[PDB]
Amino acid sequence: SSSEIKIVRDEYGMPHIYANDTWHLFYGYGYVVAQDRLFQMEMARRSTQGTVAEVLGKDFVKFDKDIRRNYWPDAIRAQIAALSPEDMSILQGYADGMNAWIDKVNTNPETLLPKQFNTFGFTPKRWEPFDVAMIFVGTMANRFSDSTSEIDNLALLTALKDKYGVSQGMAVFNQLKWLVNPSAPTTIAVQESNYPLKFNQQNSQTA
Amino acid sequence: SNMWVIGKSKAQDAKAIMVNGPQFGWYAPAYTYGIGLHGAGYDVTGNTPFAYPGLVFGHNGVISWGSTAGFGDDVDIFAERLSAEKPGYYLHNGKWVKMLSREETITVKNGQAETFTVWRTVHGNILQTDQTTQTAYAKSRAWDGKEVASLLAWTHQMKAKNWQEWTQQAAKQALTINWYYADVNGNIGYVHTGAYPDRQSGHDPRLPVPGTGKWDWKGLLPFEMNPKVYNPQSGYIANWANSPQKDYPASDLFAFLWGGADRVTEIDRLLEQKPRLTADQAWDVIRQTSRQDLNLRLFLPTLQAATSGLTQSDPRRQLVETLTRWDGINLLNDDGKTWQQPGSAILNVWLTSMLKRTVVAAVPMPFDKWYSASGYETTQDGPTGSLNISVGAKILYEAVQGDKSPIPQAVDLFAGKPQQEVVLAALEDTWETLSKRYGNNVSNWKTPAMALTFRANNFFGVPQAAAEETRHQAEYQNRGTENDMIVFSPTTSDRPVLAWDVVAPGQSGFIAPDGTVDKHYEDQLKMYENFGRKSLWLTKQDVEAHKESQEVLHVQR
Ligand SMILES: CC1(C)[C@H](C(=O)O)N2C(=O)[C@@H](NC(=O)Cc3ccccc3)[C@H]2[S@H]1O
Numbered sequence: 001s002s003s004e005i006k007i008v009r010d011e012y013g014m015p016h017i018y019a020n021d022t023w024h025l026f027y028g029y030g031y032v033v034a035q036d037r038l039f040q041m042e043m044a045r046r047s048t049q050g051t052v053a054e055v056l057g058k059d060f061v062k063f064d065k066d067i068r069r070n071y072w073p074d075a076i077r078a079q080i081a082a083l084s085p086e087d088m089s090i091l092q093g094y095a096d097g098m099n100a101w102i103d104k105v106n107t108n109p110e111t112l113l114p115k116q117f118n119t120f121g122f123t124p125k126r127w128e129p130f131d132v133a134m135i136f137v138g139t140m141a142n143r144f145s146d147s148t149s150e151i152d153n154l155a156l157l158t159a160l161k162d163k164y165g166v167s168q169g170m171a172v173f174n175q176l177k178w179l180v181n182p183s184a185p186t187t188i189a190v191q192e193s194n195y196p197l198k199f200n201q202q203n204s205q206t207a
Numbered sequence: 208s209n210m211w212v213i214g215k216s217k218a219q220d221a222k223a224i225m226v227n228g229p230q231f232g233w234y235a236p237a238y239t240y241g242i243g244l245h246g247a248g249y250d251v252t253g254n255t256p257f258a259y260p261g262l263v264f265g266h267n268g269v270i271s272w273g274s275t276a277g278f279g280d281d282v283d284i285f286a287e288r289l290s291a292e293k294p295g296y297y298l299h300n301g302k303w304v305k306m307l308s309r310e311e312t313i314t315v316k317n318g319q320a321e322t323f324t325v326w327r328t329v330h331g332n333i334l335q336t337d338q339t340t341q342t343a344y345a346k347s348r349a350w351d352g353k354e355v356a357s358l359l360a361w362t363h364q365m366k367a368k369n370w371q372e373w374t375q376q377a378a379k380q381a382l383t384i385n386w387y388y389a390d391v392n393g394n395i396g397y398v399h400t401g402a403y404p405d406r407q408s409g410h411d412p413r414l415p416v417p418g419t420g421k422w423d424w425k426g427l428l429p430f431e432m433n434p435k436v437y438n439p440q441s442g443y444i445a446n447w448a449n450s451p452q453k454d455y456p457a458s459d460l461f462a463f464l465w466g467g468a469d470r471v472t473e474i475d476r477l478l479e480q481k482p483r484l485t486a487d488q489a490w491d492v493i494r495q496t497s498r499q500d501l502n503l504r505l506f507l508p509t510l511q512a513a514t515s516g517l518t519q520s521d522p523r524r525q526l527v528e529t530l531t532r533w534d535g536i537n538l539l540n541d542d543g544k545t546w547q548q549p550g551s552a553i554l555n556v557w558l559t560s561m562l563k564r565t566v567v568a569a570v571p572m573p574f575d576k577w578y579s580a581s582g583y584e585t586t587q588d589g590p591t592g593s594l595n596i597s598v599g600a601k602i603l604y605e606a607v608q609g610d611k612s613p614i615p616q617a618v619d620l621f622a623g624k625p626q627q628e629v630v631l632a633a634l635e636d637t638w639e640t641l642s643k644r645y646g647n648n649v650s651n652w653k654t655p656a657m658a659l660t661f662r663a664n665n666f667f668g669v670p671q672a673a674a675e676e677t678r679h680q681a682e683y684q685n686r687g688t689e690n691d692m693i694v695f696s697p698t699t700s701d702r703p704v705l706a707w708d709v710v711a712p713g714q715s716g717f718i719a720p721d722g723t724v725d726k727h728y729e730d731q732l733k734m735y736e737n738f739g740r741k742s743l744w745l746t747k748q749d750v751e752a753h754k755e756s757q758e759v760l761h762v763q764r
């Protein structure tokens with residue numbers, strides 16, 4: 001019925017969730033994750049929110065400061081508060097399922113707690129929607145879609161203009177870090193289409 | 208990260224085939240997580256990083272999907288104008304505006320906590336401040352405000368049953384990511400998804416813009432601008448972090464370039480070799496590309512040209528003949544530790560010497576060290592990710608192309624000398640370096656092979672397991688951390704879709720309190736090593752016929 005969640009694991013241990021509504025589907029997914037990967041997920045949580053030094057010590061202070069300086073958690077929170085009830089059920093159901101298994105782990109730690117918890121000296125706490133969202137935000141967004149070296153580029157262009165002069169410096173910057181290179185192999189062939197925009201390639205924002 | 212999608216006109220015994228090899232580095236326990244979700248509108252199977260709600264790699268019985276890193280430029284830095292009179296403010300549209308800020312305290316196990324402040328402007332968080340020039344740099348992301356919409360788009364897209372329903376969700380994914388589509392009718396497609404800023408005219412995206420107001424983004428470009436293709440005339444879609452489309456600009460990272468030397472060409476050669484590919488031949492592309500030295504193809508011509516007048520006994524010449532006779536494919540010797548051919552070490556030492564003499568020498572210190580890498584640098588744990596053509600080698604490839612290259616050589620990297628002389632001098636260094644280490648008999652040179660390591664620290668450098676859980680594989684393979692293949696409308700089966708994957712070391716990371724590891728803690732590790740794969744089930748009858756265990760819960764929200 002509405003409350004029922006069936007979990008089936010195949011011969012490689014891969015879980016298949018059966019449920020009738022969004023909250024219950026994602027609850028089963030969070031539950032099985034908590035069974036298979038609790039310590040990895042706890043540690044990915046601390047990595048994405050910069051709370052590693054809390055359990056691992058001083059060698060991780062700088063890293064935790066660099067994670068917190070790279071995002072604005074309240075903004076993520078405000079995005080979660082704007083979700084429709086169906087969308088919020090994906091993240092709530094997932095946090096609640098995990099919490100169901102974590103609650104069983106801390107009630108019978110002697111047989112259920114991942115050994116790593118005992119090695120690193122701490123026990124897992126429950127999760128909320130924000131934490132599930134940050135696993136994604138802190139990896140995919142704040143790490144895999146966040147790359148810029150513009151301040152270093154400008155320091156390179158500065159040294160290039162100091163070594164070769166203004167014009168040659170800028171043309172040498174365009175030889176080392178071209179904006180576009182027409183001989184690049186493209187996933188979409190030129191006959192299908194080409195990107196219609198043309199960009200400035202002489203730093204004219206400061207001209 | 209790579210991907211090849213083979214549509215109807217290129218597939219054999221099937222209407223479409225998608226093979227994905229997302230490269231995030233290798234970890235213990237597994238970077239990705241296998242999961243099947245059935246109900247509430249979903250019917251999907253696959254695996255996905257960190258068990259996100261949305262599966263990044265998988266299919267729903269009608270369509271399949273996958274991703275590779277986009278590397279579009281969706282990030283710019285704004286130089287904010289500060290004032291020593293009004294600390295904590297910056298000038299924007301003619302007014303001194305107050306910075307947003309927040310305090311954070313880092314708690315420290317067995318140490319003292321530290322408190323610090325994070326500042327943010329209308330353009331994003333402050334990265335660094337130069338109090339000497341009263342300038343603060345804020346990092347502006349085009350996807351800012353859409354991170355949660357992106358997770359949701361990657362989850363709702365798993366319900367799409369055709370190209371139009373799927374691109375409606377591709378359109379809401381704001382990060383810079385290449386998404387791929389294949390379906391039971393043999394249609395294939397690609398979209399370089401994400402949010403890209405509409406910049407003011409005059410704005411060079413590789414360098415910082417004034418944050419005082421006139422250089423603010425006008426908004427975001429529309430989805431119509433995102434590079435995309437559906438059922439391309441070539442019959443296939445291939446990507447290995449290369450450019451999406453002619454005239455599309457790469458990420459502004461100085462060490463990242465899309466140029467005539469691109470490792471995606473190694474996939475093209477294999478797909479174009481034969482008129483059509485079966486699913487086994489398409490899966491076999493993983494094995495070949497994972498062992499393919501990427502510089503051979505680029506530099507062998509220049510090496511053959513520079514040595515073509517030399518006598519048979521010249522060693523410069525004998526190094527290039529050894530390369531000429533090789534297809535670039537590395538294979539271990541029986542020791543499990545050296546490669547059968549010495550070609551990669553020859554190319555590494557030659558290339559290192561060529562960059563030092565050319566690009567390195569044209570760039571002022573300390574920036575010269577950005578162009579000195581040959582691309583073969585590794586630890587004894589082996590490469591931490593994919594291997595690529597280095598940034599300096601891509602620049603040297605333009606120079607050695609002469610006026611075949613569209614990039615004006617503002618500075619002659621060969622500084623007035625004949626290129627042949629520089630190539631031959633680098634070859635002289637290579638002979639000297641390598642013959643000193645291994646002897647003068649090239650055929651018995653047993654150069655060290657790179658190895659592969661499933662690290663116990665996640666990609667951030669943080670423990671996600673004890674250090675003894677690290678796993679080790681003899682053969683480094685330049686392939687996905689996971690590999691998945693979906694076949695659509697196979698002629699050898701009545702099923703609309705067949706699909707396979709490999710998630711090593713295993714599905715489970717659990718180790719009991721007494722040290723007893725799960726039964727699924729390491730049962731995909733050998734499969735990974737041997738290019739094997741296991742079936743991904745979707746239907747209730749397949750799942751139940753391969754069932755190992757089951758649990759039924761009764762829960763009230
Ligand atoms: C900029 C990076 C830190 C790094 C680099 O070149 O420095 N890249 C990868 O390895 C490549 N990563 C991937 O392709 C992994 C991926 C990401 C998104 C979707 C699929 C695969 C990019 S980011 O990591």
Ligand SMILES: [Ca+2]
Nearest residue numbers: 282283412459
């Ligand atoms: Ca930029």
